[PDB]
Amino acid sequence: RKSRITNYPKLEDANKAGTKEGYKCTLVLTEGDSALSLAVAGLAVVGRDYYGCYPLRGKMLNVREALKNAEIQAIKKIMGLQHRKKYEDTKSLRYGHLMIMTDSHIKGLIINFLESSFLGLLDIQGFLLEFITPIIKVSITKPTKNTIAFYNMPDYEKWREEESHKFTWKQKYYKGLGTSLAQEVREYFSNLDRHLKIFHSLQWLRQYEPFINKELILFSLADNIRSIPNVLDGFKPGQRKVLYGCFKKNLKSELKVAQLAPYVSECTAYHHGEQSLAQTIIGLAQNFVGSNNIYLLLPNGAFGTRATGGKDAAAARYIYTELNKLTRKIFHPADDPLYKYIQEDEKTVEPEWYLPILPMILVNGAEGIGTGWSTYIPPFNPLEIIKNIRHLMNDEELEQMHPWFRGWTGTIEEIEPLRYRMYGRIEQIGDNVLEITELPARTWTSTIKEYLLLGLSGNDKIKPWIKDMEEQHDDNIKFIITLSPEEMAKTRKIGFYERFKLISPISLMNMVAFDPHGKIKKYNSVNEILSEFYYVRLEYYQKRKDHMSERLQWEVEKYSFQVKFIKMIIEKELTVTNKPRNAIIQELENLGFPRFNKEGKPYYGSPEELYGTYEYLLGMRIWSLTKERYQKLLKQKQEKETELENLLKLSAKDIWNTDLKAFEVGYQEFLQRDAEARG
Amino acid sequence: RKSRITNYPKLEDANKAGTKEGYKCTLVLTEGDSALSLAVAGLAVVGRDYYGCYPLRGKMLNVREALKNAEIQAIKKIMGLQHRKKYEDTKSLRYGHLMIMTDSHIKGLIINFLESSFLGLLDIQGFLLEFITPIIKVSITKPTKNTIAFYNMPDYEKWREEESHKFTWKQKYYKGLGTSLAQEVREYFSNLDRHLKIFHSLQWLRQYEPFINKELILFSLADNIRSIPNVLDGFKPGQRKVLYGCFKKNLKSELKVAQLAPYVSECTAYHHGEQSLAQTIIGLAQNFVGSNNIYLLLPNGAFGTRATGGKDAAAARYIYTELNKLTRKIFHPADDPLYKYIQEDEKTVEPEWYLPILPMILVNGAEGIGTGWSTYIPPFNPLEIIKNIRHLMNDEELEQMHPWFRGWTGTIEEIEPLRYRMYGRIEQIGDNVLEITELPARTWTSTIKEYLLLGLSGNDKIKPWIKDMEEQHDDNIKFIITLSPEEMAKTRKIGFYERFKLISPISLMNMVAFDPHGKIKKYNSVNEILSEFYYVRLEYYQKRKDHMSERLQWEVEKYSFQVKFIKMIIEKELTVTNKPRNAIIQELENLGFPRFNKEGKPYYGSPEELYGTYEYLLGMRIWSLTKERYQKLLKQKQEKETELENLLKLSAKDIWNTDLKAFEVGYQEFLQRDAEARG
């Protein structure tokens, strides 16, 4: 019985407004010429059956101060709003929803009118609605490409934690500014129309109503920085932040991966565009064959198995993690004072890069996809890496290194430089019976079982070539496969390894990373990566020595003067008793006693933190004046002198090899402790 | 074309299983005789059209070790599972869902079979399903009674934070153990059937597959403990935990209410059955007329207005809060060492009760509903409360106190002891024009506007009695109402205050709380509450004095011996230089020097923490031996002696009144600073 509006010419009344289905219709109020064009653009998608359109305001010449009654009547007449009433349902109205488009102060005015005159209206579930432009857009690339949007930060944050691990994703450049606004509006009306269809069928419900190209390159830089790792530590800023957070917290005991995450995030200004923090933590701890050769963090829980490639990991809250006992032998703490900690918003964060004792980017390898750049570096044998480090220290030729996976047992062959073929293992254990005890390194068990099931119980357009298959996988791989004499013969012809997909390639033709200087580079060989790392590590071992010796020397002087001070008072050559402050400061200065600041640096001569104080002397306890204590001070002095001399006897390479040896011991232990855990 | 199962007699096949709608049907596998009865009980509710039932196992005589093939065939035949295949949809199956009832190790076996033979099955959205008994049940009492359940803790926690503030709720006694299991199963099938109806219509979706009466009284005790406040501080354990957390954190700056919450929760073992922590925080800070007479926490944001009674408060994350400058003058820190901090799981939490300088339960009042007990105590004038405290200190008669609200301006009258009538204010400002400038204390503006709108634009069964109404509410109330001469005359007959609902009662007949001993009590008068508080506060002021004097005395002795020690060395009566440790310890002991432990307690005589050490002497810096420093030590000693004497000159009441005076000053400031803020 369509109640018709005759007094408003500019109104394009929804065909079904004023009818029984009016509660399903939506009225779009527009402000400004451009908002009208957009409303219409959106309406071209959804139609005029359940959508009405009315220009509330046209163009404003005057200026905006922080509702004309004619506008109130328009809204009321069109909406069917009768009298001052407390609304509970929109069944007595011509339209069920109201949308406002502003091109942003008029929305408030309308809101005030509605609340002031019609109480329950704005409190009705999906009544009010507004056009919102998304802040973040994400490129989902695995399960399928589709650019899901997020209209406000929190929606992004929730998806990032509870959903990001299912899709291989990245953030795309999106301003949602000018020319693209037309399509943005269509997408809004398109999504909105879907929601209303289901909202009204169920009558569960989410709510809409609860350039300068420099920024393009600015986005491409950050993406590569997030995506490609640094050659020195093999880390991407995200992983580095996590490790830094672990070193920072001085963790002795384990923590839930859900617990450690907010700590790293608060402590390291972890960017929002980055991958999920928990996911980053789990990646660092994964210990199944195919993951980390050396996992810096310990997987105390289900961090993923070989079957799905860790995709079946438990939730962050259900899993615990701690630092691997070996990690601190790889990342030597004596190197910490040497690093350049990045300064962000008055807070010092993780280093530009860490400098492990052996190339971690070669140990565990790396993988990532950025904008214009991508990288893949397989894992290599740390034992062999150390051997090559020593070859460099001793001016000996480097030996070529080929990919190597911890706990793996197949075979890898070089077909040509930078190209390999990785094999699993399949042997005939009887007539027509072939058992598979190994698969290529990064081939997940699920992939092979499904291939076996497909050939066992043929699919459309491919007929059964396998007779019987049986899994007996304990912790190791073991597919017992039986074939028909005719198929067994065709397996010999096509090939046992090719037919059961036990061969996968490894390419070293895209080993990309950031050099020590931060400029992206493509390395043409593994030795090229090892050598670049070597010279920087060698340099920093000299830096470590120098940093340590300078301080030990300072301590030698401190103890020397402390012993002098005490001794002189003991033998009554110096008296402190009842002597004025300034008199003692001058007396100590005249005797040649240096001042010491907070960092322990001495300052000799006449003039704070720039000069220091005599606090190391007069600040000593009266206990120091006693016998045993004084003899103790003498022993500390002597031991400090010996400690310095012991250091000055060593070269940068002597210290490096000492660390290397300490690593070798811990690594053999890491290896047995790892084979024992998963076997 | 119903594919029929003929080889399984115990199967009660869903009528629509094996047809086109088989994907809609659900198969319920049962284990044990009791699980069969329950499945059937549930099926009596949902019907046999879309539900099938089959006894997988009957009864087990043997014992459970940590699938018979006959069972595998049964499941396959009935489900229509053909061959080893990777499933993606359940369109080729006889049933779309599978439910297991165990009376709990067989579910795993079935899961293994399904994953091992049919890949994508268990990964399909709503395929697998299981009967889960709820852990928590909540009694929603305002928007309407309904006992919403929660099957696992996290679901409860989310509702508690994001939804609990909309309904007046409490937890009910629920074991979901034996006799009630039958109904539990029906409720499950009933809810499950609703979900499946909507799940299949939309083909957005939540998933089911992602006594000793002492415990009844144990629950009633905890409820009353959570619901009724303690008479001494007027707090309920929840609010007390929050305040304690604020005192504990030593907060100087503000924090988001979302930020402060987890801090209080971790620091105070905040129970899950308690109210929302953020909500508790917002309640403590609300400063609109009708809320707190003295808000201990500051509302730096939208913490709720007078219009809806704070129900329109912003989200915890959007609002900040800090301690009120006056709070520490109410809760005096010198009283902290006196309290009995509750010990929970090796952690010390908030005190059994705090002891403010004036009765906070009278200042702000209290309200709560427990099991068998309920309480309501209106707010009273703190100025008058202090006057009565002083009357008690000076053995003078108490003056009666009547309800009083901060910033309110109506009138309250006693009709009889413990019964009042609170009035707003309505005056005639012209012919047929009555303006309302005040409403009863706890009457919210929304309630009056809607009453005005109802009588203005009459509802069914009540005709228009008001002519025109207009709100001009700035920060104060102001309803300008115009009537018809005939209605104006009937307003004089019925009454201006009665007709516009400007009268509301206040009852002091249910002023319940826990006494100082922790036993619930009903107070028959306000003076009864004030007096009970008084004697406990009076006592603790003597305790404070005694606690302070004992320590000051200890300091007097410490300084006395420190001055002696230094002086003796200065005048060469005592030498520490190069003298053995044991020789000095014995020499100090023989001279009568007491030992001092960590808490500063002295121990005289010959014998740890039980005895102490001479560390207060020999641990002094060499600086102490010098001139200015020694003269400083002499001044500290003298000042400490004077400090003790000054304290011993005061009585418990002298200290109390000193605090009272310090409060009066800060309170006048709180009052102006509050009227200035919201006006």
Swiss-Prot record, chains A, B:
Changing residue 226 to A: Loss of enzyme activity. Mg(2+) 1 binds at residues 31, 103. The active site is at residue 318. One of its GO terms (molecular function) is ATP binding. Control of topological states of DNA by transient breakage and subsequent rejoining of DNA strands. Topoisomerase II makes double-strand breaks. Essential during mitosis and meiosis for proper segregation of daughter chromosomes. Homodimer. This is DNA topoisomerase 2. It comes from Saccharomyces cerevisiae (strain ATCC 204508 / S288c). The chain holds residues 419 to 1178 of 1428 of the full protein.
